[PDB]
Symmetry: C2
């Protein structure tokens, strides 16, 4: 449901603000991915990622992180 609210805000904000926020996220993703390559960590990331299907603790940490991202995102849009 926090994620539903994020989607609501994205799709109902002005096209100008939603576009800027999604581009911000795209750029951050690109930076992060590029950093991981620059530092040769790709295999390590991949392992760490598989865990999510099974590991309850990680699932909790990622879920908490996604909400933090949503909150920032929402703020950015409301902030203008």
């Amino acid at each position: 449901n926090p994620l539903d609210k994020w989607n609501d805000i994205i799709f109902h904000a002005s096209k100008k603000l939603s576009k800027k926020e999604l581009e911000r996220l795209l750029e951050l993703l690109a930076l992060l991915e590029t950093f991981i390559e620059k530092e040769d960590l790709e295999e390590k990331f991949e392992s760490f990622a598989k865990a999510l299907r099974i590991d309850e603790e990680l699932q909790q940490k990622i879920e908490s992180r996604k909400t933090d991202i949503v909150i920032q995102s929402m703020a950015n849009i409301l902030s203008g």
Copy 2:
């Protein structure tokens, strides 16, 4: 303009497919951020990021990476 096409596809695909794709990206961002923390790389990432305003070469690499992300994203939506 590649980014405009991404936005077009996001906002004009079914709400079901666009929501799933944006959630996929959110989860990936959360994984990446969490990984960087788990590995104590936060300061290093931050420096690497500042460069983007000035460094032509990085600007090119990130720009190429964003397009790759867009292409995958678009494919995901078209793929269903």
